[PDB]
Design a protein around this ligand. Structure first.
Ligand SMILES: [Cl-]
Ligand SMILES: [Cu+2]
Length: 139
């Protein structure tokens, strides 16, 4: 059940691909901002290489910190799937599987309308520790 997912996942050829990496020595993404065009199919490749031996995922939410906390809270209660958002979690646009240190995983999705959206990691504690970034979706 540890698998990618999200309301905007599509089985379509990506128009763009983007790489995200974990910070090697912190509970953070290496990229704290992303930018993509609206209504476009993108493959996001999350490469989790870190020196902590720690797990991480990439989760795009349909909003800011209030929505992020909601999605994060639903994932916190999904220990059997290693803390990814449960399927059909409200306002969770896309996520990768939860990746062990050394693992890489993608998610292919249609970006939402123009606007600003948080991406977070839902492994317990990481979102509260600051593991988040801002996706700005342009026209
Ligand atoms: Cl941890
Ligand atoms: Cu994490």
């Amino acid at each position: 059940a540890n698998a990618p997912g999200g309301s905007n996942v599509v089985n379509e050829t990506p128009a763009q691909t983007v790489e995200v990496r974990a910070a090697p020595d912190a509970l953070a993404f290496a990229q704290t901002s992303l930018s993509l065009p609206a209504n476009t199919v993108v493959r996001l490749d999350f490469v989790n290489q870190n020196n902590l031996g720690v797990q991480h995922n990439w989760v795009l939410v349909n909003g800011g910190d209030d929505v992020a906390a909601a999605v994060n809270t639903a994932a916190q209660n999904n220990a059997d799937a290693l803390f990814v958002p449960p399927p059909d979690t409200p306002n969770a646009l896309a996520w990768t599987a939860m990746l062990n240190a050394g693992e890489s995983g993608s998610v292919t999705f249609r970006t939402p309308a123009p606007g600003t959206y948080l991406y977070i990691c839902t492994f317990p504690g990481h979102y509260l520790a600051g593991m988040k970034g801002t996706l700005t979706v342009t026209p």
